[PDB]
Amino acid sequence: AELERQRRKLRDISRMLEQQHHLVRLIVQKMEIKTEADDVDEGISPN
């Protein structure tokens, strides 16, 4: 019955951590152009 304790790890990393990536990309928008992130596009890789 531990399967409900397999979603409590992804309840937090998909609402806080996935938002946490957006907060810091909001910061570096205002100082200097990053090269790795904002030169590829969103989506799924073919390989």
Next chain:
Amino acid sequence: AELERQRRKLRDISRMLEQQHHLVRLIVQKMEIKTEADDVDEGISPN
């Protein structure tokens, strides 16, 4: 008996990571108004 290794993943993401969301929201408070976060309220969504 692996159920005690189902709480060691949420011992860290609820004390460091949940605090980590607060540290960066403390940073962007002092530079520029973010629009997605500080226009909704705390709590649970109905859907």
Next chain:
Amino acid sequence: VDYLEAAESGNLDDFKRLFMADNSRIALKDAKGRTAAHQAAARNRVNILRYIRDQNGDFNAKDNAGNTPLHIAVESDAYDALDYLLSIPVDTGVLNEKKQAPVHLATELNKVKSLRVMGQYRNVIDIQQGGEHGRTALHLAAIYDHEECARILITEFDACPRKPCNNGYYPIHEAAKNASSKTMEVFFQWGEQRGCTREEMISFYDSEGNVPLHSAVHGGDIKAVELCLKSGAKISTQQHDLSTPVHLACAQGAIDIVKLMFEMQPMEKRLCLSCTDVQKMTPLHCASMFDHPDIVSYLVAEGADINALDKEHRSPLLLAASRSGWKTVHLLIRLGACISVKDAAARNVLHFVIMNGGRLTDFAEQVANCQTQAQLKLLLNEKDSMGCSPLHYASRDGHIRSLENLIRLGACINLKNNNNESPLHFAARYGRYNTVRQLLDSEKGSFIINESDGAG
């Protein structure tokens, strides 16, 4: 315990009475911290060893590393005691814990005069004796660059480097890999006077076919190369991988060595420099594969074959672009690259620029300045084997920045591959959001918003 401090200090006729008391203490040949009576010859006790020879003591010690009585003397400075020890027919072939005969200590530790003491006897010992990995006593004079210990061995003990180790290497190979520039000099000059000549050492084969000019550029020493060229080595002798020394240099970027061997042998530049090995790579391929933009200036000036094909059918321009060397593809274009070649999957150079993240604005700026641009922008619309033009490769892999440049230079938007798919069918399929958005708001965006494919 009485003869321990007696044979080391007194060593004459009262130590021998104390060793007669030490044999009366327990017995002769008793153990100690080191060994049985090994401390006599360690302090050059000739008369105490003569009394040990008078009482017929042991001549084979096992001092926790099997350092025998002859090996315990040469490890210290015991130059005179060995002259009595080698007058006695003692066994001179026991190996230590590190697999060393007493000859392999006098060269590895640069004991110069201890070899000369062994040289007056010369018939009780063996010079072709297998050491560590089967390295004979002249391998270890070639590794550590002990030129004088190699000077003694070859003219007094009468040796020649014809004894390979258990891996194939000859002593001319080990001296050339380790950049022993001084030790190589005494083989080619002072080894001539025995029967192992210059033209015969220079043609030794390794376990891979390495002539010792191949092993002169594994070591990267410019002085050890020109010793092999003065002795008459050709730069055309191929390995088991069919590589010449001009392939092995130029893959290191040794600009000083590739021009040096072209000065000493100007005849071979026709026979090499068009000398495709296994994998069919001319020496110009090997210098552009590893991004060396100063050798590929030199090799074309010496009359190279700028666009010679290979296995998998790649020009040196395509080979230097698949490795993402972008300093050496700007050089080949301004030097006569013939940009029309296509490899085995019909991918031209613009396929490799986009799929390796290369910058494309300054690439097209090179072809414009090199005046090829008159009408050589038909390779923007040039399909590969699967029909994919280079605008398909941009939309399939993200690359928002280089997508704008293909549209700005006038690539065809609605160009279809063999399954009749436009690049918008690629962009929508892999979820590329910003790729879709900047295809649609260009020209011909209203024509392609609702367009079918092979399936409908």
Next chain:
Amino acid sequence: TQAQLKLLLNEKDSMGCSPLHYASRDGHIRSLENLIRLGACINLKNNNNESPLHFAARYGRYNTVRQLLDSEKGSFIINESDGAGMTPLHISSQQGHTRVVQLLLNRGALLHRDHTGRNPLQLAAMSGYTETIELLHSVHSHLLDQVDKDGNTALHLATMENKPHAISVLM
């Protein structure tokens, strides 16, 4: 005391490791430059005949490798064996450090066998590192199917110790 008391820079311990071995083994990029600046010996070998570059390639220390090579005596040590016969291209690819074997190839590390007979792709296939097999095959494509002294290919060696992810790639 410095008149000549900098011979303790080249002074081996019980295991033969000079203090430049201790720098490369444990990272320490900042103190690695100071030993080289003060004139420590680069190619000094311990009791297993291993230079510090053999230590740096073995533990995946990227920036340690990069600032050993572009000093003086960096062309002498890029392809140098050890007691077993392995170059630093063998050691780095055996452990599967992909960014180090990428670095050594771009600076012209040549290819030859070790004492067993194996090339750098035999060793990366003995371990299960299927990221280093695909790198080495793209650069040097001829060394997929050559044998060692026992006649084994790269497929026998990955089968003798049960790496099923490195068999589906080698086939």
